[PDB]
Design brief:
Oligomer: part of a larger assembly
Strand content of chain G: under 5%
Chains: A mainly alpha, B mainly alpha, C mainly alpha, D mainly alpha, E mainly alpha, F mainly alpha, G mainly alpha
Structural class of chain G: mainly alpha
Order of helices and strands of chain F: HHHH
Shape of chain G: globular
CATH superfamily of chain F: lithium bound rotor ring of v- atpase
CATH topology of chain F: Four Helix Bundle (Hemerythrin (Met), subunit A)
Distance between the termini of chain F: 17 Å
């Protein structure tokens, strides 16, 4: 057996849910860096 | 052969197929909608022809919705790891593809609707660029709908 | 190039947009503009409706071919048509809920067969059919638009351009992907079950034609192992010939920048030999968008009106307002997605198949 | 635009009700399909009449 | 804060490895048994999905890099906006590479019998499809970004002078060698891999 | 066989992927960063562009360096033959010592051959020194390919 | 160059398009062959200036109206590029205009000491250096009641860190000190902004373009202090910026430079500024070195320093057109080819 | 084995995250597009009651989270299957991390739109049209989570 | 027990590291100094071949890594001691992460040296001497790894 | 148990660390002070062989690392006590991560001293005085590592 | 069990860490004070040997590590208790990470005092008076580790 706590199925759920959470953190850091061009909305 | 943790991957694939696709569609709607709102304060008659990038970003989210619905009709309590990881792959494919296609449509769309108000010949240019970025969601949808057909065989 | 477009652009559209229901809707909303073209001509058209009315005859053909090809498929709002006699019969005595196969009686007369509709492995057969359909129609479109180059070089009266570009292009394209398109038809021609022979895989036949010449694991025809070597040598001899005929015979006729001709012919050779592979795999969007249209029209029906069909509460007001609301929700989703925001994508993909895959030969 | 949707609601639902009435195998022929044909045809044909009422009322607009 | 987590995970890995090693149980951190006992369908499906995902995130990357500068450079010189679309096309072909490799890989994806499930061949064709999906998706990612950068420079040098686009299209050719080489290597890696049996 | 376990092709296909991905990453950095400097002088003296395509060609050779070792690792991998863990570790190392070798050589070619091409529009006598520094920065990947070939022939 | 075109894709390609409208050497020779300001207008109409003097019609056309409208379209192009900017780019565009805000402050508070009217000392102000409380600098005389009333809400407020108000209100001698000290603190802050948040290809070629501004301002302060100033070096060293190539060893010798040779022997030890103070017009040497530093900032592609390198080159273009139109209107043609063209 | 003890953990995380991340999305949509209302209704306060539509369409995302949180909460149990917990985790994330995206898009489009609608009054209809496409993202996440939650306890053992 | 099956992993990554980090340092030393060469030989064309000595000086670092990696490669075995893998890992790190240091030092010294040597002709000898003091770090790493690699397979057993 | 199989790992990464972390501090002391020599001797080139003392005192600590790496190398064996591996790791870290500190201090002090010794020539004797305190920090680590390495195989058994 | 095989690991890490972090603190305190000296006496070089006090007081807190890394080194045995290794690790950290703080404080106060003591001549007494409070930090860490190391082998078995 691989382990009793860190079994064959838990340890490859925590790789899938680490890859997906990595893609999520990257995509949320893309959307967090999204700013509005305010000079093209004002009168000045 | 069909363990107890096997519908985790299918449920998280059904999750990610709409999550990453809606993140990409939200970036493609928001960033290209800033360009619509910035463009149409000095030339407002271009408002309903500049609406194409948010429509294409919505088509991306429809492509993700299709995969999420078609994955959640094949989930069961006692499915194999084969079905689970193939639903996971069908989720990841359309997730990364809709995310990439939505980022590309968002970054091309605001630049296109800004160049279209200065030069009128750039409307056909931005449409022909955004059609290449639209079908990348189709390129993930193909792998998602092919891995869906191999779910229970 | 807009004189072969007049049929091929609505037809390459219809291969991607294949349905007699959506095709009749698009034909009807095009024929509404064709019959009313006098009231709409003397009218101010905004850009979207100017685009839609300038092409009121591209959409009439795009509907008229979509009805034809969705009668080739059994796809009428993602349903089948039991018009002809089937080539498959199901067994009469079988237990409920078990997996059964059908026995082949004959072949279906016109179009695809209707016993593939509620079928587990019907989508595998439709994948094989539509992939090979896209391969053969892309081959036909490319070898039709490649003859126009010969007609151009003949009208210019340039035999140097013919022997330098058309012939080494022709016996490079036809010796590889003409052979693939012939092999698809020849596998369809043989039975492979009555003969008790293994059906060859055509992907790893073209993989092994370039990697391991002369070794044939599953024999497809008699004399395959020695004819594929001849076709491989005929394809490989045209990589130096198309690259070295025209500059070395323009240089010989000066006894003019040789650097502007040799580099241009190297770029032309690399581009053409790249594109012969890169476009026959790019015509598989005719299968991609057709699969997408068929599966979306299936899973919209199954979510909207497959829920409205029930033999309980027959004649009840709730059970009929259920059908009314679900038909309205189905129809607005078909019109909004599967016509306007799906056939526009099929239109643009049949457009880029002309702009790149046809207007570069 | 309700008259177009109502005309298609006449035509499509009338064809669907006729295909349920005659026990066509693309609508009844599966196990997941409804068992009784005319029981579904009776509630699809009334919806065809409802859309015909909408087509006649919006046809005088 | 991310550097704090990078240091914290490193400290926890070092403390766990030295605790497991000092107590005579250091072979319990067993990466080989982890590879032997995880399902090959994880590696296969993950390789297919990351192939078609990371080809598209490079194709779409290059598309916005040489699309936004094409539209910016086309404001004064709008005679580039159709000729220079081959720079979109060269960074778009790296997605069809990953697509036609993902479908060829998914053809090798059948149901293996449970009695021979963690066999030699079934585990081989999980490893091969995993790394041959990675080496195609990452190569098409990097190729799409490189072709997008060398097309964004070409879209502005085209609007500067018309005779420069022919000279800088060659850099896009040498940049688009890379996705085709990844296309070759990912087919050679899963060339001897059989189906799941 | 205790010396040839069934998880050994993991480290061989990892060697294939590390030999291809990092070498084409180095080749792409080397062609993109240098194409920036070649296109930057596109207006100022356009006649020096076709002479300056050498740091693009020498960057593209770094992908051939990874291609050769990726083919030679993938040719030693078969599901029917026995495959030792020694062989898998050796293929991991020979892909890993050519991938970062070509990555560093591509970073060096990209940083040298755009500054050189970008300063070459002022001084036309720079070209011999530019080609010389590109040769010294391109043998960096040749060293890693030599180590990878010797290591492949040793480990099999 | 991998994350540049997210927010700066459209911005660069239009500025790169604005670069192609820079007049070349042949387009300057075709302007020096003109005989009339009307012929110079019609020669500029074939360039990318086309029909910018269309509302003039040959009668009210002077050599200052050309400098007005040719710079006005520069300012409107800068505002169009700034309106499409967001994030760090928009902040970089604001930091460019801060140096014009400083000049408009120092030009507005000298028009009140001389009691010149407020409506005519503001048409001479710079349009890019506009803040909303710029006309309200005509309310007080001393520095403290102009800071604490007006200049706190301005973005020039962190730059009043060393301006010591000793309750002497204002002559013309200390407004130049306040101007040089605000520009000193501004050059410090904008160099730290470029070093901090601007990415790496647009960092090294912007630190040089900004250290050149600091070196030119150091040499001009240390050389204009001979004739119209009698100040101590400990008070003179608060006017010299410390970001440049010239600071740690040579601005010390420029601080205790009591003579012209104290400047010349200080600038002989620096390598790229030696020979400027020997022969020729010094202002032409600085403008030529400015254009040679702006030319090789367009040669790096994915950089936001192309905006600075564009607007300084376009300002030099407006200065060259103004010099030519001043030569062909006053009928002096002995130095008509004194323009500066690196494009 | 089919119904373990740690099985309500994923169900409780799915009940929590559906309201947590939609409250984050609705909070960003209210926040970013309410800064624009408070900035552009100091000059034209007559259109204060029509700029409120980004805030309302942001607050619909929190109701999308609330519905799925209640429907997951009334399916939790001590002895539920691990399948039920996985489906409730998926339905919680499908509403939460999609309504977070919808709320980001509503906040960005609303702040960019109510600032441009005071200078051009014709941009209001375009703002509403873009915000409908931004709100159907959270609606699609709601559809996915309802189709999961109907599948949650159907043929469980 | 004493020559395990996973034992050539450490020798393999030691053979890898002596190319990886050494070529990374040599690439830094060639790139950052070649920037200074191409930036100063614009107006000083005759000093173009005197300025290559930082780039050659950084290439000798990669030659140092090449020699030690080949000499480790010709001692990898299948039935290898774990002591031998530990020694080869130490000898690979000792060349790699010291040649990276010497490459950083040569890359930062050499561009300043070719920028100052174009302005002062007597600074060239000082540049060469500082580059000798910078290259001797990678020479020390090679000395440590050659004295270390010679002890792998001396008294190994089992 | 008392001399396990993994026991030479700590000795190998203590032999490696005593030159890695020493040479990447010596490289900082060479580079950061050499950019201060090459930028100063463009005007005072007669001080070139006098300002190079920070580079020499940064090269001395690399020899301090070399001596300890050789003495840890020649006490490695296949069957050595785990105490010996712990002591050799401690000696390697004590030289490396303190010679890194001494190199940082020499690098920061040396360019500040050579840029100031050309304005005032009486600051050279102050630069040497600060630089001896900055350089003895590695000599302290060498003393600690030699007192460790003398204790490595003294009363070891098994 | 009380004296395991892995017990000299903590003692060796403590013996290393006693001198490693004090060398880092002394390096910071020497580096910033040396920059302050070399920038403050290019004009007044008469204060060269007067301003050497921060460099000396930063060099003393490395001798503080050199004392305890010899007193820990001469109590390292093969068969030593785990209690001894724990105390030697605590002593090495107690000198090291306190002399690092003392070196940070001496390095900041040193250049801040020698750049200002060239102006005011009687800021030198205040600089020494603050550096005494900054150097008793390392003295306190020395006292803590010398009280630990007198207990590492007191009543061990």
């Amino acid at each position: 057996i691989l382990s009793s706590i860190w079994t064959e199925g838990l340890l490859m759920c925590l790789i899938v849910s680490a890859l997906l959470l990595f893609i999520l953190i990257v995509a949320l850091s893309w959307i967090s860096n999204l700013d509005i061009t305010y000079g093209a909305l004002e009168k000045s | 052969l069909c363990p107890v943790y096997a519908p985790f991957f299918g449920a998280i694939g059904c999750a990610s197929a709409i999550i990453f696709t809606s993140l990409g569609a939200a970036y493609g709607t928001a960033k290209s909608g800033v360009g619509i709102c910035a463009t149409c304060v000095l030339r407002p008659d271009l408002l309903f022809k500049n609406i194409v990038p948010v429509i294409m970003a919505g088509i991306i989210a429809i492509y993700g919705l299709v995969v999420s619905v078609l994955v959640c009709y094949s989930l069961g309590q006692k499915q194999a790891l084969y079905t689970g990881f193939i639903q996971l792959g069908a989720g990841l494919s359309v997730g990364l593809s809709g995310l990439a296609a939505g980022f590309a449509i968002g970054i091309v769309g605001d630049a296109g609707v800004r160049g279209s108000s200065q030069q009128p010949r750039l409307f056909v240019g931005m449409i022909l660029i955004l059609i290449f970025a639209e079908v990348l969601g189709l390129y993930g949808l193909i792998v998602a709908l092919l891995l869906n057909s191999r779910a229970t065989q | 190039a807009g004189l072969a477009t007049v049929v091929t652009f609505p037809f390459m559209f219809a291969i991607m947009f294949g349905d007699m229901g959506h095709g009749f809707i698009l034909f009807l909303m095009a024929l509404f503009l064709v019959l009313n073209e006098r009231k709409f001509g003397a009218m101010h058209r905004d850009e979207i409706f100017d685009m839609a009315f300038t092409g009121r005859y591209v959409l009439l053909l795009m509907g008229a071919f979509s009805v034809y090809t969705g009668l080739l498929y059994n796809d009428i709002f993602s349903k089948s048509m039991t018009i002809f006699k089937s080539g498959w019969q199901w067994p009469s005595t079988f237990r409920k809920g078990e997996s059964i196969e059908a026995k082949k009686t004959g072949v279906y007369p016109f179009g695809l067969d209707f016993a593939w509709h509620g079928t587990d492995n019907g989508l595998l057969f439709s994948n094989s059919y539509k992939m090979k359909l896209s391969i053969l129609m892309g081959y036909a479109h490319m070898t039709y638009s490649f003859m126009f180059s010969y007609i151009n070089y003949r009208a210019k009266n340039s035999k140097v351009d013919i022997i330098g570009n058309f012939i080494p292009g022709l016996v490079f394209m036809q010796s590889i992907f003409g052979y693939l398109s012939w092999a698809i038809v020849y596998k369809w021609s043989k039975d492979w079950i009555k003969d008790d022979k293994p059906a060859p895989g055509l992907l790893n036949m073209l993989i092994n034609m370039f990697l391991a010449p002369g070794t044939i694991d599953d024999q497809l025809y008699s004399g395959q192992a020695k004819l594929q070597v001849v076709l491989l040598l005929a394809a490989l001899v045209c990589v130096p010939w198309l690259l070295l005929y025209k500059p070395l015979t323009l240089r010989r006729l000066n006894k003019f920048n040789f650097g502007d001709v040799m580099i241009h012919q190297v770029i032309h050779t690399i581009e053409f030999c790249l594109n012969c592979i890169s476009h026959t795999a790019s015509y598989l969007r005719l299968w991609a968008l057709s699969l997408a249209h068929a599966q979306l029209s299936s899973v919209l029906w199954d979510m909207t009106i497959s829920n409205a069909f029930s033999s309980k509460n027959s004649g009840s007001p709730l059970a009929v307002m259920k059908v009314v609301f679900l038909f309205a929700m189905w129809f607005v989703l078909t019109v909004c997605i599967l016509v306007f925001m799906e056939g526009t994508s099929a239109m643009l993909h049949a457009l880029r198949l002309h702009w790149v895959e046809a207007m570069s030969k | 635009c309700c008259t177009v949707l109502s005309a298609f609601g006449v035509v499509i639902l009338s064809v669907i009700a006729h295909l349920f009435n005659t026990n066509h195998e693309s609508f009844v022929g599966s196990i997941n399909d409804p068992e009784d044909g005319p029981a579904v045809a009776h509630t699809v044909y009334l919806a065809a009449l409802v859309y015909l009422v909408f087509f006649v009322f919006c046809g005088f607009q | 804060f991310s550097h704090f987590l990078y240091y914290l995970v490193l400290i926890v890995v070092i403390v766990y490895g030295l605790y497991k090693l000092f107590t005579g149980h250091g072979s319990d951190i067993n990466f080989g048994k982890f590879l032997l006992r995880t399902s090959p369908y994880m590696w296969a499906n993950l390789g297919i999905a990351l192939c078609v995902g990371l080809s598209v995130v490079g194709a779409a990357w290059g598309i916005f890099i040489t699309g936004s500068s094409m539209i910016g450079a086309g404001v004064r010189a709008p005679r580039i906006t159709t000729k220079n679309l081959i720079s979109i096309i060269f960074c778009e072909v790296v997605a069809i590479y990953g697509l036609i490799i993902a479908i060829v890989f998914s053809s090798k994806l059948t149901v293996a019998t449970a009695e021979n499930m963690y066999s030699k061949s079934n585990l081989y064709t999980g490893y091969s499809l995993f790394w041959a999906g990675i080496t195609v998706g990452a190569s098409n990612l990097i190729c799409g970004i490189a072709v997008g950068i060398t097309g964004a420079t070409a879209a502005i040098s085209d609007a500067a002078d018309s005779a420069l686009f022919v000279k800088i299209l060659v850099i896009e050719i040498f940049g688009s060698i890379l996705g085709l080489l990844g296309l070759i290597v990912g087919l050679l890696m899963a060339g001897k891999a059989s189906e799941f049996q | 066989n205790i010396y040839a376990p069934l998880y050994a092709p993991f480290f061989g296909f990892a060697g294939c992927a590390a030999a291809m991905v990092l070498s084409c990453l180095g080749a792409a950095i080397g062609t993109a960063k240098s194409g920036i400097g070649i296109a930057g002088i596109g207006t100022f003296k356009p006649e020096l562009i076709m002479k300056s395509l050498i740091p693009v060609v020498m960057s593209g050779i770094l992908a051939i360096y990874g291609l050769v070792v990726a083919v030679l690792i993938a040719g030693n991998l078969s599901p029917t033959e026995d495959y030792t863990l020694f062989n898998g570790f050796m293929h991991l190392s020979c892909g890993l010592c050519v991938g970062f070798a070509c990555l560093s050589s591509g970073y060096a070619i990209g940083m040298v051959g755009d500054v050189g091409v970008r300063k070459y529009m002022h001084q036309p006598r720079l070209f011999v020194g530019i080609v010389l520094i590109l040769i010294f920065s391109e043998v960096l990947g040749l060293y890693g390919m030599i180590v990878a070939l010797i290591l492949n022939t040793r480990g099999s | 160059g991998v994350y540049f075109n997210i927010d700066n894709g459209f911005i660069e390609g239009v500025v790169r398009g604005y670069r192609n409208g820079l007049l070349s050497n042949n387009q300057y020779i075709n302007l020096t062959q003109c005989d009339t300001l009307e012929d110079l207008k019609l020669q500029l109409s074939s360039t990318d200036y086309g029909n910018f003097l269309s509302s003039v019609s040959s009668e009210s056309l002077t050599t200052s109206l050309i400098q007005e409208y040719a710079s006005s379209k520069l300012y409107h192009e800068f505002n169009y590029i700034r309106d499409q900017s967001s994030g760090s780019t928009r902040k970089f565009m604001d930091y460019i205009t801060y140096g014009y805000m400083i000049d408009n402050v120092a030009l507005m508070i000298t028009g009140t000491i001389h009691d010149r009217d407020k409506g005519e000392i503001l048409q001479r102000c710079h349009p890019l250096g506009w803040f909303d409380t710029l006309p309200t600098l005509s309310v007080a005389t001393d520095l403290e009641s102009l800071y604490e009333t007006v200049l706190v809400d301005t973005p020039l407020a962190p730059y009043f860190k060393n301006c010591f108000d000793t309750a002497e209100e204002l002559d013309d001698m200390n407004i130049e000190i306040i101007r040089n000290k605000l520009y000193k603190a501004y050059l410090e802050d904008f160099y730290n902004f470029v070093t901090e948040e601007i990415p790496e290809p647009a960092k090294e070629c912007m630190q040089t373009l900004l250290g050149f501004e600091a070196d030119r301002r150091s040499i001009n302060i240390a050389l204009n202090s001979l004739q119209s100033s009698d100040i101590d070096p400990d008070l003179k060293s608060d006017l010299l910026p410390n970001i440049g190539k010239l600071y740690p060893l040579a601005t010390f010798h420029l601080a205790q430079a009591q003579d012209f040779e104290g400047v010349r022997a200080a600038l002989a030890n620096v390598y790229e500024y030696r020979g400027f103070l020997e022969t020729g017009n010094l202002e032409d040497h600085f403008y030529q070195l400015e254009m040679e530093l702006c030319r090789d900032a367009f040669t790096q592609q994915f950089a936001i320093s192309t905006v600075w390198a564009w607007m300084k080159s376009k300002e030099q273009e407006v200065r060259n057109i103004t010099w030519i139109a001043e030569c062909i209107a006053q009928n002096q043609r002995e130095r008509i080819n004194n323009y500066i063209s690196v494009y």
